[PDB]
PDB file of N, CA, C and O and ligand atoms in Angstrom:
ATOM      1  N   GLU D   1       1.297  16.813   3.536  1.00  0.00           N
ATOM      2  CA  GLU D   1       0.569  18.025   3.898  1.00  0.00           C
ATOM      3  C   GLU D   1      -0.674  17.661   4.676  1.00  0.00           C
ATOM      4  O   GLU D   1      -0.681  17.629   5.906  1.00  0.00           O
ATOM      5  N   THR D   2      -1.731  17.375   3.925  1.00  0.00           N
ATOM      6  CA  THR D   2      -3.001  17.008   4.518  1.00  0.00           C
ATOM      7  C   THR D   2      -2.926  15.604   5.117  1.00  0.00           C
ATOM      8  O   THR D   2      -2.146  14.744   4.693  1.00  0.00           O
ATOM      9  N   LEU D   3      -3.747  15.394   6.115  1.00  0.00           N
ATOM     10  CA  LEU D   3      -3.799  14.114   6.790  1.00  0.00           C
ATOM     11  C   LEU D   3      -4.854  13.256   6.134  1.00  0.00           C
ATOM     12  O   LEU D   3      -5.808  13.754   5.527  1.00  0.00           O
ATOM     13  N   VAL D   4      -4.646  11.947   6.197  1.00  0.00           N
ATOM     14  CA  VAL D   4      -5.613  11.013   5.652  1.00  0.00           C
ATOM     15  C   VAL D   4      -5.921   9.998   6.739  1.00  0.00           C
ATOM     16  O   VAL D   4      -5.209   9.879   7.746  1.00  0.00           O
ATOM     17  N   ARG D   5      -7.026   9.296   6.550  1.00  0.00           N
ATOM     18  CA  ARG D   5      -7.574   8.422   7.589  1.00  0.00           C
ATOM     19  C   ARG D   5      -7.759   7.046   6.989  1.00  0.00           C
ATOM     20  O   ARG D   5      -8.783   6.807   6.329  1.00  0.00           O
ATOM     21  N   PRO D   6      -6.801   6.116   7.163  1.00  0.00           N
ATOM     22  CA  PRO D   6      -6.987   4.752   6.644  1.00  0.00           C
ATOM     23  C   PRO D   6      -8.229   4.094   7.233  1.00  0.00           C
ATOM     24  O   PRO D   6      -8.517   4.229   8.427  1.00  0.00           O
ATOM     25  N   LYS D   7      -8.957   3.384   6.384  1.00  0.00           N
ATOM     26  CA  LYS D   7     -10.065   2.533   6.831  1.00  0.00           C
ATOM     27  C   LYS D   7      -9.513   1.410   7.702  1.00  0.00           C
ATOM     28  O   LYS D   7      -8.298   1.203   7.755  1.00  0.00           O
ATOM     29  N   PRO D   8     -10.362   0.674   8.409  1.00  0.00           N
ATOM     30  CA  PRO D   8      -9.836  -0.265   9.422  1.00  0.00           C
ATOM     31  C   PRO D   8      -8.894  -1.323   8.882  1.00  0.00           C
ATOM     32  O   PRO D   8      -7.883  -1.629   9.524  1.00  0.00           O
ATOM     33  N   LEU D   9      -9.180  -1.906   7.711  1.00  0.00           N
ATOM     34  CA  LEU D   9      -8.326  -2.963   7.192  1.00  0.00           C
ATOM     35  C   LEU D   9      -6.968  -2.428   6.757  1.00  0.00           C
ATOM     36  O   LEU D   9      -5.930  -3.012   7.082  1.00  0.00           O
ATOM     37  N   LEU D  10      -6.942  -1.315   6.004  1.00  0.00           N
ATOM     38  CA  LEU D  10      -5.652  -0.724   5.676  1.00  0.00           C
ATOM     39  C   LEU D  10      -4.883  -0.333   6.941  1.00  0.00           C
ATOM     40  O   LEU D  10      -3.661  -0.500   7.001  1.00  0.00           O
ATOM     41  N   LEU D  11      -5.579   0.180   7.952  1.00  0.00           N
ATOM     42  CA  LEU D  11      -4.894   0.507   9.200  1.00  0.00           C
ATOM     43  C   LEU D  11      -4.208  -0.714   9.796  1.00  0.00           C
ATOM     44  O   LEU D  11      -3.058  -0.631  10.245  1.00  0.00           O
ATOM     45  N   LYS D  12      -4.901  -1.858   9.824  1.00  0.00           N
ATOM     46  CA  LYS D  12      -4.274  -3.081  10.326  1.00  0.00           C
ATOM     47  C   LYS D  12      -3.048  -3.459   9.501  1.00  0.00           C
ATOM     48  O   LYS D  12      -2.021  -3.877  10.048  1.00  0.00           O
ATOM     49  N   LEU D  13      -3.126  -3.320   8.177  1.00  0.00           N
ATOM     50  CA  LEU D  13      -1.961  -3.580   7.338  1.00  0.00           C
ATOM     51  C   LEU D  13      -0.787  -2.676   7.723  1.00  0.00           C
ATOM     52  O   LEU D  13       0.364  -3.128   7.846  1.00  0.00           O
ATOM     53  N   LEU D  14      -1.040  -1.368   7.855  1.00  0.00           N
ATOM     54  CA  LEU D  14       0.051  -0.440   8.159  1.00  0.00           C
ATOM     55  C   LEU D  14       0.669  -0.743   9.527  1.00  0.00           C
ATOM     56  O   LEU D  14       1.905  -0.747   9.681  1.00  0.00           O
ATOM     57  N   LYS D  15      -0.172  -1.029  10.516  1.00  0.00           N
ATOM     58  CA  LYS D  15       0.357  -1.313  11.853  1.00  0.00           C
ATOM     59  C   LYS D  15       1.142  -2.606  11.862  1.00  0.00           C
ATOM     60  O   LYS D  15       2.060  -2.764  12.675  1.00  0.00           O
ATOM     61  N   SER D  16       0.800  -3.534  10.972  1.00  0.00           N
ATOM     62  CA  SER D  16       1.466  -4.828  10.962  1.00  0.00           C
ATOM     63  C   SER D  16       2.936  -4.721  10.584  1.00  0.00           C
ATOM     64  O   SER D  16       3.716  -5.631  10.923  1.00  0.00           O
ATOM     65  N   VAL D  17       3.354  -3.633   9.939  1.00  0.00           N
ATOM     66  CA  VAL D  17       4.773  -3.414   9.654  1.00  0.00           C
ATOM     67  C   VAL D  17       5.391  -2.398  10.602  1.00  0.00           C
ATOM     68  O   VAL D  17       6.460  -1.860  10.323  1.00  0.00           O
ATOM     69  N   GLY D  18       4.745  -2.156  11.744  1.00  0.00           N
ATOM     70  CA  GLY D  18       5.324  -1.336  12.781  1.00  0.00           C
ATOM     71  C   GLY D  18       4.823   0.085  12.855  1.00  0.00           C
ATOM     72  O   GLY D  18       5.265   0.824  13.734  1.00  0.00           O
ATOM     73  N   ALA D  19       3.915   0.510  11.974  1.00  0.00           N
ATOM     74  CA  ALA D  19       3.334   1.826  12.151  1.00  0.00           C
ATOM     75  C   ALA D  19       2.579   1.870  13.477  1.00  0.00           C
ATOM     76  O   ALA D  19       1.922   0.905  13.868  1.00  0.00           O
ATOM     77  N   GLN D  20       2.673   3.003  14.152  1.00  0.00           N
ATOM     78  CA  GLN D  20       2.034   3.219  15.452  1.00  0.00           C
ATOM     79  C   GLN D  20       1.177   4.470  15.410  1.00  0.00           C
ATOM     80  O   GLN D  20       1.195   5.299  16.322  1.00  0.00           O
ATOM     81  N   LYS D  21       0.439   4.639  14.331  1.00  0.00           N
ATOM     82  CA  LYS D  21      -0.406   5.797  14.111  1.00  0.00           C
ATOM     83  C   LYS D  21      -1.780   5.332  13.644  1.00  0.00           C
ATOM     84  O   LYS D  21      -1.932   4.244  13.075  1.00  0.00           O
ATOM     85  N   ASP D  22      -2.785   6.155  13.929  1.00  0.00           N
ATOM     86  CA  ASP D  22      -4.110   5.982  13.349  1.00  0.00           C
ATOM     87  C   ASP D  22      -4.373   6.974  12.241  1.00  0.00           C
ATOM     88  O   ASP D  22      -5.148   6.678  11.322  1.00  0.00           O
ATOM     89  N   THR D  23      -3.723   8.139  12.302  1.00  0.00           N
ATOM     90  CA  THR D  23      -3.872   9.217  11.339  1.00  0.00           C
ATOM     91  C   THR D  23      -2.512   9.419  10.682  1.00  0.00           C
ATOM     92  O   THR D  23      -1.483   9.365  11.365  1.00  0.00           O
ATOM     93  N   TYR D  24      -2.498   9.657   9.367  1.00  0.00           N
ATOM     94  CA  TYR D  24      -1.262   9.623   8.603  1.00  0.00           C
ATOM     95  C   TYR D  24      -1.263  10.741   7.571  1.00  0.00           C
ATOM     96  O   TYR D  24      -2.314  11.161   7.080  1.00  0.00           O
ATOM     97  N   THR D  25      -0.076  11.173   7.145  1.00  0.00           N
ATOM     98  CA  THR D  25      -0.094  11.875   5.867  1.00  0.00           C
ATOM     99  C   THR D  25      -0.079  10.871   4.709  1.00  0.00           C
ATOM    100  O   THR D  25       0.225   9.704   4.894  1.00  0.00           O
ATOM    101  N   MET D  26      -0.392  11.333   3.499  1.00  0.00           N
ATOM    102  CA  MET D  26      -0.298  10.414   2.373  1.00  0.00           C
ATOM    103  C   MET D  26       1.123   9.896   2.210  1.00  0.00           C
ATOM    104  O   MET D  26       1.327   8.734   1.859  1.00  0.00           O
ATOM    105  N   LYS D  27       2.109  10.749   2.462  1.00  0.00           N
ATOM    106  CA  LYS D  27       3.506  10.336   2.385  1.00  0.00           C
ATOM    107  C   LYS D  27       3.788   9.173   3.340  1.00  0.00           C
ATOM    108  O   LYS D  27       4.463   8.203   2.978  1.00  0.00           O
ATOM    109  N   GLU D  28       3.244   9.242   4.556  1.00  0.00           N
ATOM    110  CA  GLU D  28       3.437   8.163   5.512  1.00  0.00           C
ATOM    111  C   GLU D  28       2.726   6.893   5.077  1.00  0.00           C
ATOM    112  O   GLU D  28       3.254   5.797   5.289  1.00  0.00           O
ATOM    113  N   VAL D  29       1.521   7.004   4.493  1.00  0.00           N
ATOM    114  CA  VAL D  29       0.834   5.809   4.008  1.00  0.00           C
ATOM    115  C   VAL D  29       1.693   5.093   2.987  1.00  0.00           C
ATOM    116  O   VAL D  29       1.849   3.868   3.048  1.00  0.00           O
ATOM    117  N   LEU D  30       2.254   5.852   2.042  1.00  0.00           N
ATOM    118  CA  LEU D  30       3.110   5.262   1.009  1.00  0.00           C
ATOM    119  C   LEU D  30       4.375   4.667   1.620  1.00  0.00           C
ATOM    120  O   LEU D  30       4.822   3.595   1.187  1.00  0.00           O
ATOM    121  N   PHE D  31       4.949   5.331   2.623  1.00  0.00           N
ATOM    122  CA  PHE D  31       6.128   4.813   3.298  1.00  0.00           C
ATOM    123  C   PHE D  31       5.842   3.452   3.908  1.00  0.00           C
ATOM    124  O   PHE D  31       6.610   2.503   3.730  1.00  0.00           O
ATOM    125  N   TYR D  32       4.717   3.313   4.603  1.00  0.00           N
ATOM    126  CA  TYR D  32       4.464   2.021   5.238  1.00  0.00           C
ATOM    127  C   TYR D  32       3.995   0.981   4.230  1.00  0.00           C
ATOM    128  O   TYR D  32       4.292  -0.208   4.387  1.00  0.00           O
ATOM    129  N   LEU D  33       3.269   1.388   3.180  1.00  0.00           N
ATOM    130  CA  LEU D  33       2.891   0.412   2.148  1.00  0.00           C
ATOM    131  C   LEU D  33       4.135  -0.144   1.474  1.00  0.00           C
ATOM    132  O   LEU D  33       4.233  -1.355   1.228  1.00  0.00           O
ATOM    133  N   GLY D  34       5.111   0.723   1.200  1.00  0.00           N
ATOM    134  CA  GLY D  34       6.367   0.243   0.637  1.00  0.00           C
ATOM    135  C   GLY D  34       7.087  -0.706   1.570  1.00  0.00           C
ATOM    136  O   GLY D  34       7.567  -1.752   1.134  1.00  0.00           O
ATOM    137  N   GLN D  35       7.085  -0.411   2.870  1.00  0.00           N
ATOM    138  CA  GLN D  35       7.723  -1.323   3.812  1.00  0.00           C
ATOM    139  C   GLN D  35       6.983  -2.644   3.856  1.00  0.00           C
ATOM    140  O   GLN D  35       7.613  -3.708   3.924  1.00  0.00           O
ATOM    141  N   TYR D  36       5.643  -2.604   3.791  1.00  0.00           N
ATOM    142  CA  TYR D  36       4.872  -3.844   3.762  1.00  0.00           C
ATOM    143  C   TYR D  36       5.232  -4.701   2.547  1.00  0.00           C
ATOM    144  O   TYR D  36       5.491  -5.908   2.675  1.00  0.00           O
ATOM    145  N   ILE D  37       5.261  -4.094   1.357  1.00  0.00           N
ATOM    146  CA  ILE D  37       5.620  -4.806   0.132  1.00  0.00           C
ATOM    147  C   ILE D  37       7.022  -5.401   0.256  1.00  0.00           C
ATOM    148  O   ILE D  37       7.266  -6.540  -0.165  1.00  0.00           O
ATOM    149  N   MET D  38       7.967  -4.624   0.803  1.00  0.00           N
ATOM    150  CA  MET D  38       9.342  -5.109   0.972  1.00  0.00           C
ATOM    151  C   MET D  38       9.394  -6.280   1.927  1.00  0.00           C
ATOM    152  O   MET D  38       9.970  -7.335   1.612  1.00  0.00           O
ATOM    153  N   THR D  39       8.830  -6.110   3.100  1.00  0.00           N
ATOM    154  CA  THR D  39       9.004  -7.117   4.133  1.00  0.00           C
ATOM    155  C   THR D  39       8.310  -8.411   3.732  1.00  0.00           C
ATOM    156  O   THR D  39       8.786  -9.495   4.079  1.00  0.00           O
ATOM    157  N   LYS D  40       7.205  -8.327   2.988  1.00  0.00           N
ATOM    158  CA  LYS D  40       6.510  -9.536   2.549  1.00  0.00           C
ATOM    159  C   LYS D  40       6.993 -10.021   1.191  1.00  0.00           C
ATOM    160  O   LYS D  40       6.476 -11.024   0.675  1.00  0.00           O
ATOM    161  N   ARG D  41       7.994  -9.358   0.625  1.00  0.00           N
ATOM    162  CA  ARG D  41       8.604  -9.751  -0.640  1.00  0.00           C
ATOM    163  C   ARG D  41       7.540  -9.990  -1.717  1.00  0.00           C
ATOM    164  O   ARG D  41       7.553 -10.985  -2.452  1.00  0.00           O
ATOM    165  N   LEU D  42       6.580  -9.060  -1.795  1.00  0.00           N
ATOM    166  CA  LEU D  42       5.498  -9.230  -2.762  1.00  0.00           C
ATOM    167  C   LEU D  42       5.929  -8.917  -4.186  1.00  0.00           C
ATOM    168  O   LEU D  42       5.235  -9.327  -5.125  1.00  0.00           O
ATOM    169  N   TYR D  43       7.024  -8.190  -4.371  1.00  0.00           N
ATOM    170  CA  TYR D  43       7.539  -7.885  -5.696  1.00  0.00           C
ATOM    171  C   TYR D  43       8.208  -9.126  -6.281  1.00  0.00           C
ATOM    172  O   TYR D  43       8.635 -10.045  -5.561  1.00  0.00           O
ATOM    173  N   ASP D  44       8.302  -9.142  -7.603  1.00  0.00           N
ATOM    174  CA  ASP D  44       9.031 -10.193  -8.305  1.00  0.00           C
ATOM    175  C   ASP D  44      10.518  -9.898  -8.189  1.00  0.00           C
ATOM    176  O   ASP D  44      10.965  -8.804  -8.562  1.00  0.00           O
ATOM    177  N   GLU D  45      11.283 -10.866  -7.650  1.00  0.00           N
ATOM    178  CA  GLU D  45      12.726 -10.687  -7.494  1.00  0.00           C
ATOM    179  C   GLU D  45      13.423 -10.249  -8.785  1.00  0.00           C
ATOM    180  O   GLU D  45      14.377  -9.460  -8.736  1.00  0.00           O
ATOM    181  N   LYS D  46      12.949 -10.703  -9.940  1.00  0.00           N
ATOM    182  CA  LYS D  46      13.603 -10.411 -11.217  1.00  0.00           C
ATOM    183  C   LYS D  46      12.988  -9.243 -11.978  1.00  0.00           C
ATOM    184  O   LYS D  46      13.543  -8.824 -12.997  1.00  0.00           O
ATOM    185  N   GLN D  47      11.854  -8.716 -11.518  1.00  0.00           N
ATOM    186  CA  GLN D  47      11.108  -7.639 -12.136  1.00  0.00           C
ATOM    187  C   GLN D  47      10.540  -6.851 -10.960  1.00  0.00           C
ATOM    188  O   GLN D  47       9.362  -6.945 -10.654  1.00  0.00           O
ATOM    189  N   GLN D  48      11.410  -6.090 -10.304  1.00  0.00           N
ATOM    190  CA  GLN D  48      11.093  -5.654  -8.944  1.00  0.00           C
ATOM    191  C   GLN D  48      10.061  -4.542  -8.921  1.00  0.00           C
ATOM    192  O   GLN D  48       9.543  -4.227  -7.851  1.00  0.00           O
ATOM    193  N   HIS D  49       9.751  -3.957 -10.065  1.00  0.00           N
ATOM    194  CA  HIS D  49       8.692  -2.969 -10.189  1.00  0.00           C
ATOM    195  C   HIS D  49       7.302  -3.585 -10.260  1.00  0.00           C
ATOM    196  O   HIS D  49       6.321  -2.834 -10.239  1.00  0.00           O
ATOM    197  N   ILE D  50       7.183  -4.905 -10.332  1.00  0.00           N
ATOM    198  CA  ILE D  50       5.887  -5.591 -10.401  1.00  0.00           C
ATOM    199  C   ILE D  50       5.568  -6.211  -9.041  1.00  0.00           C
ATOM    200  O   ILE D  50       6.346  -7.003  -8.517  1.00  0.00           O
ATOM    201  N   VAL D  51       4.397  -5.903  -8.501  1.00  0.00           N
ATOM    202  CA  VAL D  51       3.963  -6.411  -7.198  1.00  0.00           C
ATOM    203  C   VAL D  51       2.866  -7.444  -7.431  1.00  0.00           C
ATOM    204  O   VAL D  51       1.869  -7.147  -8.100  1.00  0.00           O
ATOM    205  N   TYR D  52       3.039  -8.645  -6.894  1.00  0.00           N
ATOM    206  CA  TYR D  52       2.048  -9.716  -7.004  1.00  0.00           C
ATOM    207  C   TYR D  52       1.353  -9.862  -5.660  1.00  0.00           C
ATOM    208  O   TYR D  52       1.983 -10.223  -4.667  1.00  0.00           O
ATOM    209  N   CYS D  53       0.061  -9.576  -5.624  1.00  0.00           N
ATOM    210  CA  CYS D  53      -0.664  -9.476  -4.358  1.00  0.00           C
ATOM    211  C   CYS D  53      -1.966 -10.279  -4.319  1.00  0.00           C
ATOM    212  O   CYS D  53      -2.772 -10.083  -3.411  1.00  0.00           O
ATOM    213  N   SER D  54      -2.174 -11.206  -5.266  1.00  0.00           N
ATOM    214  CA  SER D  54      -3.471 -11.873  -5.387  1.00  0.00           C
ATOM    215  C   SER D  54      -3.808 -12.777  -4.210  1.00  0.00           C
ATOM    216  O   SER D  54      -4.981 -13.134  -4.030  1.00  0.00           O
ATOM    217  N   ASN D  55      -2.822 -13.208  -3.432  1.00  0.00           N
ATOM    218  CA  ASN D  55      -3.101 -14.045  -2.280  1.00  0.00           C
ATOM    219  C   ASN D  55      -2.716 -13.364  -0.986  1.00  0.00           C
ATOM    220  O   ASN D  55      -2.401 -14.018   0.006  1.00  0.00           O
ATOM    221  N   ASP D  56      -2.712 -12.048  -1.000  1.00  0.00           N
ATOM    222  CA  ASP D  56      -2.334 -11.248   0.142  1.00  0.00           C
ATOM    223  C   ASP D  56      -3.448 -10.261   0.473  1.00  0.00           C
ATOM    224  O   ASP D  56      -4.216  -9.847  -0.396  1.00  0.00           O
ATOM    225  N   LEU D  57      -3.517  -9.868   1.745  1.00  0.00           N
ATOM    226  CA  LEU D  57      -4.432  -8.799   2.149  1.00  0.00           C
ATOM    227  C   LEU D  57      -4.336  -7.594   1.219  1.00  0.00           C
ATOM    228  O   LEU D  57      -5.343  -6.950   0.920  1.00  0.00           O
ATOM    229  N   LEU D  58      -3.132  -7.252   0.775  1.00  0.00           N
ATOM    230  CA  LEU D  58      -2.989  -6.065  -0.065  1.00  0.00           C
ATOM    231  C   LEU D  58      -3.817  -6.191  -1.337  1.00  0.00           C
ATOM    232  O   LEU D  58      -4.418  -5.207  -1.786  1.00  0.00           O
ATOM    233  N   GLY D  59      -3.852  -7.387  -1.926  1.00  0.00           N
ATOM    234  CA  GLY D  59      -4.675  -7.597  -3.115  1.00  0.00           C
ATOM    235  C   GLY D  59      -6.157  -7.428  -2.842  1.00  0.00           C
ATOM    236  O   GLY D  59      -6.891  -6.871  -3.662  1.00  0.00           O
ATOM    237  N   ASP D  60      -6.616  -7.890  -1.680  1.00  0.00           N
ATOM    238  CA  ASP D  60      -8.016  -7.689  -1.307  1.00  0.00           C
ATOM    239  C   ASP D  60      -8.328  -6.207  -1.144  1.00  0.00           C
ATOM    240  O   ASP D  60      -9.411  -5.742  -1.511  1.00  0.00           O
ATOM    241  N   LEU D  61      -7.392  -5.451  -0.589  1.00  0.00           N
ATOM    242  CA  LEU D  61      -7.642  -4.042  -0.340  1.00  0.00           C
ATOM    243  C   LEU D  61      -7.573  -3.240  -1.624  1.00  0.00           C
ATOM    244  O   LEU D  61      -8.380  -2.323  -1.827  1.00  0.00           O
ATOM    245  N   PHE D  62      -6.606  -3.552  -2.487  1.00  0.00           N
ATOM    246  CA  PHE D  62      -6.423  -2.780  -3.719  1.00  0.00           C
ATOM    247  C   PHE D  62      -7.359  -3.244  -4.817  1.00  0.00           C
ATOM    248  O   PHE D  62      -7.592  -2.499  -5.779  1.00  0.00           O
ATOM    249  N   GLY D  63      -7.863  -4.463  -4.715  1.00  0.00           N
ATOM    250  CA  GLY D  63      -8.804  -4.953  -5.695  1.00  0.00           C
ATOM    251  C   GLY D  63      -8.176  -5.406  -6.993  1.00  0.00           C
ATOM    252  O   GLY D  63      -8.854  -5.397  -8.029  1.00  0.00           O
ATOM    253  N   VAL D  64      -6.913  -5.835  -6.963  1.00  0.00           N
ATOM    254  CA  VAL D  64      -6.194  -6.315  -8.145  1.00  0.00           C
ATOM    255  C   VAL D  64      -5.320  -7.503  -7.757  1.00  0.00           C
ATOM    256  O   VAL D  64      -4.900  -7.636  -6.601  1.00  0.00           O
ATOM    257  N   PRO D  65      -5.002  -8.365  -8.734  1.00  0.00           N
ATOM    258  CA  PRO D  65      -4.088  -9.489  -8.460  1.00  0.00           C
ATOM    259  C   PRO D  65      -2.631  -9.090  -8.489  1.00  0.00           C
ATOM    260  O   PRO D  65      -1.797  -9.804  -7.903  1.00  0.00           O
ATOM    261  N   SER D  66      -2.304  -7.995  -9.161  1.00  0.00           N
ATOM    262  CA  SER D  66      -0.939  -7.530  -9.347  1.00  0.00           C
ATOM    263  C   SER D  66      -0.999  -6.109  -9.873  1.00  0.00           C
ATOM    264  O   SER D  66      -2.030  -5.662 -10.397  1.00  0.00           O
ATOM    265  N   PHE D  67       0.117  -5.400  -9.741  1.00  0.00           N
ATOM    266  CA  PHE D  67       0.208  -4.053 -10.295  1.00  0.00           C
ATOM    267  C   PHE D  67       1.679  -3.688 -10.497  1.00  0.00           C
ATOM    268  O   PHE D  67       2.574  -4.259  -9.859  1.00  0.00           O
ATOM    269  N   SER D  68       1.926  -2.687 -11.339  1.00  0.00           N
ATOM    270  CA  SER D  68       3.271  -2.149 -11.488  1.00  0.00           C
ATOM    271  C   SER D  68       3.409  -0.856 -10.698  1.00  0.00           C
ATOM    272  O   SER D  68       2.491  -0.031 -10.667  1.00  0.00           O
ATOM    273  N   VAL D  69       4.567  -0.683 -10.046  1.00  0.00           N
ATOM    274  CA  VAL D  69       4.840   0.583  -9.357  1.00  0.00           C
ATOM    275  C   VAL D  69       4.920   1.767 -10.297  1.00  0.00           C
ATOM    276  O   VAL D  69       4.882   2.902  -9.827  1.00  0.00           O
ATOM    277  N   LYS D  70       5.047   1.532 -11.620  1.00  0.00           N
ATOM    278  CA  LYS D  70       5.041   2.612 -12.595  1.00  0.00           C
ATOM    279  C   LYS D  70       3.660   3.182 -12.843  1.00  0.00           C
ATOM    280  O   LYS D  70       3.543   4.220 -13.504  1.00  0.00           O
ATOM    281  N   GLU D  71       2.607   2.552 -12.316  1.00  0.00           N
ATOM    282  CA  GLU D  71       1.227   2.946 -12.603  1.00  0.00           C
ATOM    283  C   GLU D  71       0.693   3.826 -11.469  1.00  0.00           C
ATOM    284  O   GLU D  71      -0.147   3.415 -10.672  1.00  0.00           O
ATOM    285  N   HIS D  72       1.160   5.074 -11.416  1.00  0.00           N
ATOM    286  CA  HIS D  72       0.882   5.842 -10.197  1.00  0.00           C
ATOM    287  C   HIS D  72      -0.588   6.231 -10.121  1.00  0.00           C
ATOM    288  O   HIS D  72      -1.144   6.250  -9.018  1.00  0.00           O
ATOM    289  N   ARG D  73      -1.243   6.543 -11.246  1.00  0.00           N
ATOM    290  CA  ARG D  73      -2.665   6.892 -11.170  1.00  0.00           C
ATOM    291  C   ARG D  73      -3.443   5.744 -10.586  1.00  0.00           C
ATOM    292  O   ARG D  73      -4.303   5.936  -9.706  1.00  0.00           O
ATOM    293  N   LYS D  74      -3.151   4.538 -11.058  1.00  0.00           N
ATOM    294  CA  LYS D  74      -3.855   3.376 -10.559  1.00  0.00           C
ATOM    295  C   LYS D  74      -3.584   3.169  -9.083  1.00  0.00           C
ATOM    296  O   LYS D  74      -4.509   2.897  -8.312  1.00  0.00           O
ATOM    297  N   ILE D  75      -2.325   3.307  -8.666  1.00  0.00           N
ATOM    298  CA  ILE D  75      -2.018   3.143  -7.250  1.00  0.00           C
ATOM    299  C   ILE D  75      -2.806   4.126  -6.395  1.00  0.00           C
ATOM    300  O   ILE D  75      -3.334   3.747  -5.347  1.00  0.00           O
ATOM    301  N   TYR D  76      -2.892   5.410  -6.794  1.00  0.00           N
ATOM    302  CA  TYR D  76      -3.669   6.349  -5.984  1.00  0.00           C
ATOM    303  C   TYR D  76      -5.138   5.963  -5.920  1.00  0.00           C
ATOM    304  O   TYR D  76      -5.762   6.056  -4.846  1.00  0.00           O
ATOM    305  N   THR D  77      -5.715   5.488  -7.033  1.00  0.00           N
ATOM    306  CA  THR D  77      -7.120   5.103  -6.934  1.00  0.00           C
ATOM    307  C   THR D  77      -7.280   3.913  -5.998  1.00  0.00           C
ATOM    308  O   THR D  77      -8.267   3.858  -5.255  1.00  0.00           O
ATOM    309  N   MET D  78      -6.313   2.989  -5.988  1.00  0.00           N
ATOM    310  CA  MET D  78      -6.402   1.824  -5.106  1.00  0.00           C
ATOM    311  C   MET D  78      -6.251   2.215  -3.649  1.00  0.00           C
ATOM    312  O   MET D  78      -6.949   1.673  -2.784  1.00  0.00           O
ATOM    313  N   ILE D  79      -5.342   3.147  -3.355  1.00  0.00           N
ATOM    314  CA  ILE D  79      -5.179   3.619  -1.979  1.00  0.00           C
ATOM    315  C   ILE D  79      -6.420   4.351  -1.518  1.00  0.00           C
ATOM    316  O   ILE D  79      -6.910   4.130  -0.402  1.00  0.00           O
ATOM    317  N   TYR D  80      -6.981   5.234  -2.368  1.00  0.00           N
ATOM    318  CA  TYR D  80      -8.155   5.994  -1.941  1.00  0.00           C
ATOM    319  C   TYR D  80      -9.406   5.152  -1.711  1.00  0.00           C
ATOM    320  O   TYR D  80     -10.268   5.585  -0.926  1.00  0.00           O
ATOM    321  N   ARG D  81      -9.459   3.940  -2.250  1.00  0.00           N
ATOM    322  CA  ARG D  81     -10.584   3.015  -1.948  1.00  0.00           C
ATOM    323  C   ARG D  81     -10.512   2.688  -0.459  1.00  0.00           C
ATOM    324  O   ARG D  81     -11.487   2.245   0.105  1.00  0.00           O
ATOM    325  N   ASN D  82      -9.349   2.893   0.138  1.00  0.00           N
ATOM    326  CA  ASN D  82      -9.078   2.475   1.506  1.00  0.00           C
ATOM    327  C   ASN D  82      -8.881   3.643   2.459  1.00  0.00           C
ATOM    328  O   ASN D  82      -8.359   3.438   3.568  1.00  0.00           O
ATOM    329  N   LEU D  83      -9.252   4.861   2.069  1.00  0.00           N
ATOM    330  CA  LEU D  83      -9.166   6.012   2.950  1.00  0.00           C
ATOM    331  C   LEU D  83     -10.572   6.534   3.200  1.00  0.00           C
ATOM    332  O   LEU D  83     -11.428   6.458   2.313  1.00  0.00           O
ATOM    333  N   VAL D  84     -10.809   7.031   4.416  1.00  0.00           N
ATOM    334  CA  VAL D  84     -12.079   7.674   4.766  1.00  0.00           C
ATOM    335  C   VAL D  84     -11.951   9.126   4.313  1.00  0.00           C
ATOM    336  O   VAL D  84     -11.252   9.918   4.939  1.00  0.00           O
ATOM    337  N   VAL D  85     -12.572   9.469   3.188  1.00  0.00           N
ATOM    338  CA  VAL D  85     -12.475  10.844   2.704  1.00  0.00           C
ATOM    339  C   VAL D  85     -13.479  11.756   3.430  1.00  0.00           C
ATOM    340  O   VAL D  85     -13.165  12.922   3.716  1.00  0.00           O
TER     341      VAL D  85
HETATM  342 CL1  LIG T   1     -11.789  -1.656   5.633  1.00  0.00          CL
HETATM  343 CL1  LIG T   2       0.443  -6.126 -13.327  1.00  0.00          CL
END
């Protein structure tokens, strides 16, 4: 629905997986973040709901070493640290 504005570092992350936008819906941000996690194989192959990001740009942006995709409240707070509200 509403548009969101990634901060510069998150924008570079999104573009690095082929996004060609500066302005996004939240749905699009999640779409490209998922593609980033997939393409960089940040999830554990045997526990695919767990993302390990402590040595990746994503960890610097989200401010955690790892997270579970089941933790949606936490994921939204981590994404919003990276949006210009
Ligand atoms: Cl930034
Ligand atoms: Cl975790």
